[PDB]
Write an enzyme that holds these catalytic residues in place. Structure first.
Site, PDB file in Angstrom:
ATOM      1  N   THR A   1       0.851  -1.226   0.000  1.00 45.25           N
ATOM      2  CA  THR A   1       0.000   0.000   0.000  1.00 45.25           C
ATOM      3  C   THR A   1       0.867   1.248   0.000  1.00 45.25           C
ATOM      4  OG1 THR A   1      -1.787  -1.093   1.245  1.00 45.25           O
ATOM      5  CG2 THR A   1      -1.776   1.337   1.215  1.00 45.25           C
ATOM      6  N   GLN A   2       0.508   2.211  -0.844  1.00 42.23           N
ATOM      7  CA  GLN A   2       1.222   3.476  -0.901  1.00 42.23           C
ATOM      8  C   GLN A   2       0.236   4.624  -1.044  1.00 42.23           C
ATOM      9  OE1 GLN A   2       0.588   1.596  -3.641  1.00 42.23           O
ATOM     10  NE2 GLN A   2       2.417   1.500  -4.947  1.00 42.23           N
ATOM     11  N   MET A 107      -1.648  -6.408  -2.598  1.00 41.23           N
ATOM     12  CA  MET A 107      -1.830  -5.184  -1.820  1.00 41.23           C
ATOM     13  C   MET A 107      -0.646  -4.227  -1.997  1.00 41.23           C
ATOM     14  SD  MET A 107      -4.832  -5.471  -0.439  1.00 41.23           S
ATOM     15  CE  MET A 107      -4.810  -4.273   0.890  1.00 41.23           C
TER      16      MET A 107
ATOM     17  N   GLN D   1      -5.303   4.748   2.581  1.00 40.94           N
ATOM     18  CA  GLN D   1      -5.121   3.268   2.557  1.00 40.94           C
ATOM     19  C   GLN D   1      -5.703   2.693   1.272  1.00 40.94           C
ATOM     20  OE1 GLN D   1      -3.456   1.199   4.772  1.00 40.94           O
ATOM     21  NE2 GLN D   1      -3.890  -0.462   3.318  1.00 40.94           N
TER      22      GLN D   1
END
Ligand code: MG
Lengths: 233, 235, 250, 222, 231, 244, 211, 240
Positions: A1-2, A107, D1
């Site tokens: 995730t970024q 992810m 997120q």
């Protein structure tokens, strides 16, 4: 995730009778800062495909390299690399679409929205979308980000359904695209005046136009606008 | 010494050819396929009279519709049976159906050549896999340690195999009944066995569509042996 | 690739002999003579600097090595095997002791660790034994001065005095006649030089002989002052001049 | 997120006849309040006289369908070109879905075809693998609008026979393919009126012993 | 002799005997014939039985809708290699929405077989394969040897007595290449070719196996009464 | 490849023997003799150092007798380096048991553990076995005083009296002759030294060629004491028993 | 959801409802909440239907493999344990399952409750689901060991009805099962709507409800 | 890891390592198993080459795998410990996962499987051990006696012997053991087991071990004196 850092806004495209058109501005924003003004976000793959990318630029540069490597790899032990076994738009798309969905499934996505535009071996028009979630869809007109909200409505007035495609010429399609880019410049805070436009025609091939500018703008009416209600002066 | 996966100058794998010699020393097992069912029969060959012969298990159920007989180093068969039973039940889990006899056999034969330097050597046992499915009906297969499997109308493996196979060559026809096949297995077993055939040193079994795979009682087999003796004395 | 030699290269023969260990001991026998003598107030270890060429700078080749500030080592046999053992011995003194107890290991335990490494090369897969015998001299608070021999098998024995390599049989006989339990360090050095002269053919001087001692603490070699309990290393390598001075009183 | 999931809208509907079956679904693909495509096929012919639709998150739906079509291909290879029965396909899909129990395919899936006795069949799945055979099932966005209607017009629920006053139920007479298609079209026309994610077009796949046939109908584009 | 104990050892003349012994297993195997025109490609295989009670060992395996092969030698090795091809064809379709070129399929088989010839512990594959397929550059026929050598051909044969069929195809080269848009005549030429390798036995209904692929023809295998037409 | 050079340490002979175990036992037969004798009131361990030198530092030396814990000790016969590997493992096992159950490890359990390690090297791994035979002398509250032996095969057995190493045939006969069940430690001490004195390959048995130990309940009240004899103490017991 | 099961003189009864909800929306009127593991074993369903279906069908695999290896039918005690041991691997991972394992073996009829927690309890009577409290009331007041098969079937049927009425997330239909030593016997699907009115009349119960 | 294929086929179709493992069993001390009508007896030879042995602590030849099953063996002693440990772990693992103790047949099948696995796994040699596994299934009064061997084959026996001179004692058992009427009592069963060992043993002193296993986890090992009384009575009847 970024989270995306350096970003590229809308990519717009549409089908016409003999091919497809795709366009995208030359800006690389850093939040509200218009940091980079010489960013090419349309990347041609061979002479039959153009991939337009919006979203994170570092991820765009990574994808750009994957495509460049794809061309190299296809040529390996391939006497027909510039002929029957050359890369097709559908091959290039499916590859990217596979990568995007795999990355989201780990992810760790490529924070992008991509439109692959091109013309197939049999002369069929190819236009399909894919994004960071691995979501895909096809339509006579496709646009990313703001273009989806402002450009599509205008482009769909030209090609509202599949049967309108043969009736639409390249001059009309290009005109509609160029108008849409002007509208986005008026209304998207993260857009630039300078843009690139590419046409992939089944007869005239790939025409790549750089250093285009939004022109014929309307601003004169602004002089008459005073205050926010009651002010006369 | 030499590799376990080595080819001979003739183009054969040494270890596979040698395991075939071990199978020749095994007790006889015979299978006969008919349109009323497939019959499987084995020579028990107890090494001593104190050995309780009913504990000799050379005929085995894989599924309700598939049975199996073995010959050679019978200890090697246990993991093959375990795999077969797992494959049969797992396919039922994935596909809500019985597995094809050929597919089951192919799954067993995939283990065969998984040896090298995986297991250290090929299996030293041959299998007669008999069963029934809706697509190809009653089937009998011969699974070897080479990984090759042939379908057979009738087949004998073990020490009395070539003598029995010659006998099966003459006796088998496409219109055999189940009862005729039973007596035929008993007849050929009695011919190639060292000791005198009875219900304690030989075992019968069959697979039918209705009742599935069944190992025969010693009382049931004893009657078929008595029926055999009388019909041979009849001419 | 992969190391596919996962089996022992040293194995028992029908007679009960471990061939590779015996052959390693034969390599040690061919090696240049080295010796060790234990005194009441110190230990001395010595060997010949057998220079392979006169163009070679034999000072750059150290046959006598510091393992800890209070422990030193010398060898007979294959030099390269010795060099790597010294590297491992130095490290194991830290990893399996100093980083745990905050102090350097006693001689016998460091010897035990070196011995273990050599034993493992005798049993582990795809390796030959080390072709060296080591003489390890050292001092620690509770055991005092000590001298140990370590063989290719991993067996180690404590000595009052001993020799290994080329002329060990003759040298050990020479040491038996001269050794007693009242020797001072200078007496042991004198006996070491006498014993070593017998096995040396050519030049016999400070430049061709390597000699070190485990003796008194050397605060001049510590490198810092201010901590009373830190008094400096007991290991000291004698200089070329210091050896020649004692060769005049020989 | 990062949210790995999304909602592409859409609504699907499967009905099982006596000797046929239908699987219908709208052709509209959306995100939030935008239209992505007015024609993005959602119901597929997977082979062996089986049709399939994975409604919900389009990416997971395309991946599941892609995998099942592949499972059919390998079933042929592995089992001597044997035909994959609808009940066997159902059980296989359960295992495809449950392989991601801890990161599911966010889709409600339906398949339709014929059973081994030639009768119409529809199987319904949840995102994690539970499944069961049904006669009628609407899935997706406007499922709640359609299913009550089908309970009423297909299974004749709450309908009794005049004169008896609730003593005798309306008999469960079988429906023809033409009758079913009317109920399908009226279901989607009604859903389109009251659900913003439903519209543009309706594609129906009809499965009979003769094979798979398609029918397309326009829907309101607002 | 002293250099045939494993695949990792060159002989003094630069030969690899284990590979040559694997090549020998193909010669023991039953004959199979491959040939093509500009529109279709055909495989014809003589199946072998154990005895009269036994079935005839299958020789042809389908890899995709547009590709497949016939085997000669160790059948389990063909199953391993054909399974690999199935996966590679399938990877190309799923990832690139692209049918795998027959030439590229040959390159992949070559490289897979090669790894088994240069490493210790393993063994070479003991099977030869004739791969036919129709892709974007038309019809193709490949010959695979477990040495790693893959060769694109107009026609060929492998197995016992394959030299007779190979000579026939070498004579008929100019004729059968021109059989375009006529599947039955191309198969006839293949059945006539494989007939040059027969001795004592002849082509029966459960003996003969035929496969074909072409322009508008998926890879399909013909066995049993389906090949009685060509007997 | 590598196969060419493999001795194959873990294979049966045609007669059903393990080559390397048999050859390891041959190696052990040349090692110094070690003797264990169990009495009603304690155990004796006596062992002969191999042809020593006058310059060997005996008081700090240990090649035969090792302490595993406060209750259990071993006498070694064979490769000393191999023995130390096993000894350290046994010491760790004893402490693991003590940490887990808060009780001292029973003798047999420790013996079985070490014997299992030896066994493993004869069945798998392709490594040479440990060229070591142990005599275990120990005490626990279940069986009291115990003697065991283990050899490279990993087989272990219990004993009243036993020898390992050189001249075990001669030694075992002498022990079998003079041993009795009601024997005491002081008598066992004498028997052990007398047996070594007769079986030794040396000209005479002296203190510098011996290692000696006793495990006694001759510790103040219900508890056990291990006594590794010092060079001077071995010299005294040699005079006491009338050997020197 | 509502499920129960109890042991009695002539075996074990197993009764369940048929409803499935997605919030307030009823997603299924007819859901099989009983798993036919094999001809002598039943499993109820509580919680994630996916997890109930998957793991209990996997249990069936293990029970069948047991019979093939040992040549003997698996006990209810062993079967229930195999299931609980599967749960204990995904302990904490988020599985949701509450099932009674019903059967007949050597020790007679058997009943075990098993949940995602791994718990495994033996007992004469169990009930799970959002409506188990209503079911227990009917059961506790009418249960005897001396029950006839006819009365026992009615009891389990009536106990579900009680829950279906009061519990919002229970209803649709009632599925009955009777487990004997010769195997289980299905006693049909009973619409609650029709059953309610029927029972109200015959029994006189539910007076407060107007019909 | 060490992967070398030690157990391999020879040109004549023999696995020599497995056959040489049987030679190790031939060398091992004699073990015998006899099942009566309501019991099983396990007899074991103790070679008297080893005296000064401590019989309290020396590993006994018969080992309890569970409270209702025992295992004796012939062959390499160290090898047998590994099989015994594995068997004991499996016995508790079965009780833990299935809630029933193992059957004698199941336990035999497991041990036999371990032995088989060691005949076609890389880097390992076969167990030089044959076992006799005896006991009673839970809630069953039928005696059970099984035999395993290095190859991994196993089978049930009315009476069986393994180890050195087992050929001789099997000869005795084959003529003395009647299947129609097995040793009806514990006495008769033990007597026949001792008689069979007396054909081979040498002295009937501490050379014979006897362990009686009865139903419902009733396992006891006979003492020297108890066995000595059988030895006395046998020879006094023989003097005639
Ligand atoms: Mg709408």
């Amino acid at each position: 995730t970024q989270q995306p850092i350096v970003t590229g806004t809308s990519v717009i495209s549409m089908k016409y009778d003999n091919g497809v058109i795709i366009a995208a501005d030359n800006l690389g924003s850093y939040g509200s800062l218009l940091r980079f003004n010489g960013v090419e976000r349309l990347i041609p793959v061979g002479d039959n495909t153009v991939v337009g990318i919006s979203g994170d630029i570092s991820d765009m540069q990574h994808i750009e390299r994957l495509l460049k490597d794809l061309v190299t790899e296809n040529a390996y032990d391939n006497p027909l690399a510039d002929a029957e076994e050359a890369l097709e738009p559908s091959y290039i798309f499916e590859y990217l679409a596979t990568v995007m969905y795999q990355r989201r499934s780990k992810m760790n996505p490529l924070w992008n929205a991509i439109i692959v535009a091109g013309v197939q071996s049999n002369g069929d028009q190819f236009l399909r979308y894919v994004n960071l979630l691995g979501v895909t869809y096809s339509s006579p007109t496709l646009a990313t980000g703001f273009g989806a909200h402002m450009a599509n409505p205008l482009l769909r007035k030209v090609v509202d359904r599949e049967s309108d495609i043969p009736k639409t010429t390249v001059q009309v399609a290009e005109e509609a695209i160029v108008n849409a880019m002007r509208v986005l410049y008026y209304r998207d805070a993260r857009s630039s005046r300078n843009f690139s436009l590419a046409i992939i025609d089944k007869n005239t091939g790939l025409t790549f136009k750089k250093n285009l500018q939004v022109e014929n703008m309307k601003w004169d009416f602004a002089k008459d606008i005073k205050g926010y209600g009651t002010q006369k002066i | 010494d030499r590799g376990v996966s080595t080819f001979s100058p003739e183009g054969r794998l040494f270890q596979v050819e040698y395991s075939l010699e071990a199978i020749k020393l095994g007790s006889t097992a015979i299978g006969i396929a008919t349109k009323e069912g497939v019959v499987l029969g084995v020579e028990k060959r107890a090494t001593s009279p104190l050995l309780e012969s009913d504990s000799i298990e050379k005929i085995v159920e894989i599924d309700r519709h598939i049975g199996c007989a073995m010959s050679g180093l019978t200890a090697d068969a246990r993991s093959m049976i375990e795999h077969a039973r797992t494959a049969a039940v797992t396919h039922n889990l994935y596909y809500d159906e019985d597995i094809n006899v050929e597919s089951l056999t192919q799954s067993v034969c995939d283990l065969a050549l998984r040896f090298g330097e995986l297991m250290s050597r090929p299996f030293g046992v041959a299998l007669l896999i008999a069963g029934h499915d809706a697509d190809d009906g009653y089937q009998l297969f011969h699974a070897e340690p080479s990984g090759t499997f042939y379908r057979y109308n009738a087949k004998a493996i073990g020490s009395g195999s070539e003598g029995a196979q010659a006998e099966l060559l003459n006796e088998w026809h496409s219109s055999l009944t189940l009862k005729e096949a039973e007596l035929l297995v008993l007849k050929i077993l009695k011919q190639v066995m060292e000791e005198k055939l009875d219900e304690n040193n030989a075992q019968l079994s069959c697979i039918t569509k209705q009742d599935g795979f069944k190992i025969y009682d010693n009382e049931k087999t004893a009657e078929l042996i008595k029926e055999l003796k009388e019909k041979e004395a009849a001419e | 690739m992969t190391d596919r030699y996962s089996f022992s290269l040293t194995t028992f023969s029908p007679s009960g002999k471990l061939g590779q260990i015996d052959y390693a001991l034969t390599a040690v026998k061919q090696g240049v003579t080295s010796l060790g003598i234990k005194a009441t107030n110190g230990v001395v270890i010595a060997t010949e600097k057998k220079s392979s060429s006169p163009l070679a700078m034999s000072e750059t080749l150290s046959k006598v090595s510091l393992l800890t500030p209070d422990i030193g080592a010398v060898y007979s046999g294959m030099g390269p095997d010795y060099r790597v053992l010294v590297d491992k011995s130095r490290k194991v003194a830290h990893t399996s002791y100093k980083r745990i107890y905050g102090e350097y290991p006693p001689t016998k335990l460091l010897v035990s660790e070196v011995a273990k490494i050599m034993q493992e090369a005798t049993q582990s897969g795809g390796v030959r034994p080390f072709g060296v015998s080591l003489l390890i001299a050292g001092h620690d608070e509770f055991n005092g001065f000590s001298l140990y021999q370590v063989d290719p098998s991993g067996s180690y024995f404590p000595w009052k005095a001993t020799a290994i390599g080329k002329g060990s049989v003759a040298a050990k006989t020479f040491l038996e006649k001269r050794w007693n339990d009242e020797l001072e360090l200078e007496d042991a050095i004198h006996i070491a030089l006498l014993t070593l002269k017998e096995s040396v053919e050519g030049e016999f001087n400070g430049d061709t002989i390597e000699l070190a001692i485990i003796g008194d603490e050397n605060p001049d070699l510590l490198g810092y002052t201010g901590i009373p309990t830190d008094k400096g290393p007991r290991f000291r390598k004698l200089t070329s001049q210091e050896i020649n001075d004692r060769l005049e009183a020989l | 997120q990062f949210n790995p999931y999304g909602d592409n809208g859409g609504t699907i509907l499967g009905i099982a006849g006596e000797d046929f079956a239908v699987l219908a679904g709208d052709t509209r693909n959306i995100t939030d309040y935008s239209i992505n495509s007015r024609y993005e096929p959602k119901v597929f012919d997977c082979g062996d006289n089986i049709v399939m639709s994975a409604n919900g998150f389009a990416a997971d739906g395309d991946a599941l369908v892609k995998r099942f079509k592949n499972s059919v291909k390998w079933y042929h290879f592995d089992h001597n070109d044997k035909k994959l029965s609808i009940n066997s396909a159902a059980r296989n899909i359960q295992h495809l879905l449950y392989s991601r129990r801890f990161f599911p395919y966010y889709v409600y899936n339906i398949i339709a075809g014929l059973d081994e006795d030639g009768k119409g069949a529809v199987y319904s799945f949840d995102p994690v693998g539970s499944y069961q055979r049904e006669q009628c099932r609407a899935g997706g966005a406007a499922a709640s609008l359609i299913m009550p209607f089908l309970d009423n017009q297909v299974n004749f629920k709450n309908q009794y026979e005049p004169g008896t006053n609730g003593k005798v139920k309306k008999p469960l007479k079988y429906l023809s393919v033409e009758e079913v298609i009317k109920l399908v079209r009226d279901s989607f026309t009604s859903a389109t009126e009251r659900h913003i994610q439903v519209g543009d077009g309706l594609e129906i796949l009809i499965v009979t012993k003769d094979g798979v046939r398609k029918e397309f109908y326009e829907l309101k584009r607002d | 002799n002293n250099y045939d104990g494993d695949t990792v050892t060159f002989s003094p003349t630069g030969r690899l005997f284990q590979v040559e012994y694997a090549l020998e297993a193909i010669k023991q195997g039953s004959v199979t014939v491959g040939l093509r025109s500009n529109t279709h490609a055909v495989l014809v295989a003589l199946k072998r039985n154990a005895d009269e009670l036994s079935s005839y060992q299958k020789k042809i395996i389908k890899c995709d809708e547009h590709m497949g092969l016939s085997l000669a030698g160790l059948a389990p090795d063909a199953r391993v290699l054909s399974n690999y091809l199935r996966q590679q064809c399938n990877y190309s379709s799923l990832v690139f929405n692209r049918k795998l070129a027959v030439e590229r399929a040959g390159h992949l088989l070559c490289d897979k077989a090669q790894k088994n010839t240069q490493s210790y512990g393993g063994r070479p594959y003991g099977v030869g394969l004739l791969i036919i397929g129709y892709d974007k550059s038309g019809a193709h026929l490949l010959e695979f040897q477990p040495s790693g050598n893959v060769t694109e051909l107009y026609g060929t044969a492998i197995g016992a007595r394959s030299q007779g069929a190979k000579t026939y195809l070498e004579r008929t080269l100019d004729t059968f290449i021109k059989i375009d848009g006529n599947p039955d005549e191309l198969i006839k030429a293949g059945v006539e070719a494989i007939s040059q390798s027969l001795r004592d036995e002849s082509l029966t209904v459960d003996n003969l196996s035929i496969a074909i692929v072409g322009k508008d023809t998926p890879f399909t295998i013909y066995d049993g009464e389906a090949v009685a037409k060509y007997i | 490849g590598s196969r060419r050079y493999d001795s194959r340490t873990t294979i049966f002979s045609p007669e059903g023997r393990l080559y390397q175990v048999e050859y390891a036992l041959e190696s052990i037969s040349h090692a110094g003799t070690a003797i264990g004798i169990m009495a009603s009131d304690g155990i004796v361990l006596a062992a002969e150092r191999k042809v020593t030198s006058t310059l060997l530092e005996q008081d700090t030396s240990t090649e035969k007798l090792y302490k595993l814990n406060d209750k259990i000790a071993v006498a070694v016969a064979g490769l000393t380096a191999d023995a130390e590997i096993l000894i350290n493992t046994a010491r760790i096992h004893a402490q693991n048991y003590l940490k887990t159950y808060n009780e001292d490890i029973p003798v047999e359990i420790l013996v079985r553990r070490l014997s299992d390690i030896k066994q493993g090297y004869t069945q798998h791994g392709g490594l040479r076995p440990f060229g070591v035979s142990f005599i275990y002398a120990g005490y626990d509250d279940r069986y009291g005083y115990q003697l065991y032996t283990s050899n490279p095969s990993g087989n272990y057995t219990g004993w009243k009296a036993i020898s390992v190493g050189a001249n075990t045939s001669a030694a075992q006969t002498l022990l079998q002759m003079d041993y009795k069940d009601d024997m005491k430690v002081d008598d066992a001490i004498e028997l052990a030294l007398k047996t070594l004195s007769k079986t030794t390959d040396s000209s005479a048995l002296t203190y510098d060629r011996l290692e000696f130990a006793t495990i006694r309940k001759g510790a103040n009240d219900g508890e056990v004491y291990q006594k590794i004899f010092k060079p001077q103490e071995i010299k005294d017991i040699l005079v006491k028993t009338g050997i020197t | 959801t509502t499920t129960l099961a109890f042991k009695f003189q002539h075996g074990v009864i197993a009764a369940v409802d048929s409803r499935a909800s997605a919030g307030s929306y009823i997603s299924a009127l007819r859901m099989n909440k009983v798993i036919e593991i094999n001809p002598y074993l039943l499993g109820t369903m509580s919680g994630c239907a996916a997890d109930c279906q998957y793991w209990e069908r996997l249990l069936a695999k293990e029970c069948r493999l047991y019979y093939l290896r040992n040549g003997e039918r698996i006990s209810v005690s062993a079967a229930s344990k195999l299931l609980s041991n599967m749960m204990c691997q995904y302990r904490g991972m988020g599985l949701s399952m509450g099932s009674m394992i019903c059967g007949w073996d050597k020790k007679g009829p058997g009943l075990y409750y098993v949940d995602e927690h791994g718990t495994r309890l033996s007992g004469n009577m169990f009930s799970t689901g959002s409506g188990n409290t209503y079911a227990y009331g009917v059961l506790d007041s009418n249960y005897k060991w001396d029950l006839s098969v006819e009365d026992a079937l009615y009891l389990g049927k009536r106990s579900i009805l009680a829950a279906a009425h009061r519990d919002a997330y229970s209803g649709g239909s009632v599925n009955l099962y009777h487990v004997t030593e010769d195997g289980w016997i299905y006693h049909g699907n009973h619409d609650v709507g029709e059953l309610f009115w029927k029972v109200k009349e015959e029994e006189g119960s539910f007076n407060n409800v107007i019909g | 890891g060490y992967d070398r294929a030690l157990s391999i086929f020879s040109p004549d179709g023999h696995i020599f390592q497995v056959e040489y493992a049987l030679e190790a069993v031939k060398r091992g001390t004699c073990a015998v198993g006899v099942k009566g009508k309501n019991c099983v007896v396990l007899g074991c030879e103790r070679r008297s080459t080893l005296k000064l042995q401590d019989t309290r602590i020396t590993p006994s030849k018969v080992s309890k795998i569970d409270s209702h099953v025992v295992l004796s063996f012939s062959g390499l002693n160290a090898d047998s410990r590994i099989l015994i440990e594995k068997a004991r772990v499996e016995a508790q693992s079965h009780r833990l996962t299935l809630e029933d103790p193992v059957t004698v047949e199941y336990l035999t099948r497991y041990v036999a499987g371990v032995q088989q696995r060691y005949t076609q796994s890389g880097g390992v040699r076969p167990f030089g051990v044959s076992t006799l596994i005896a006991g009673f299934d839970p809630r069953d009064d039928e005696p059970k006696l099984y035999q395993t061997e290095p190859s991994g084959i196993y089978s049930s026996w009315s009476a069986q012997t393994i180890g050195r001179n087992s050929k001789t004692v099997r000869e005795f058992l084959e003529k003395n053991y009647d299947r129609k009427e097995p040793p009806a009592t514990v006495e008769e069963c033990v007597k026949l087991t001792v008689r069979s060992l007396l054909e081979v043993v040498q002295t009937g002193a501490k050379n014979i071990e006897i362990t009686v296993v009865k139903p419902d986890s009733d396992i006891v090992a006979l003492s020297s004196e108890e066995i000595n009384q059988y030895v006395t009575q046998i020879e006094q009847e023989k003097q005639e």
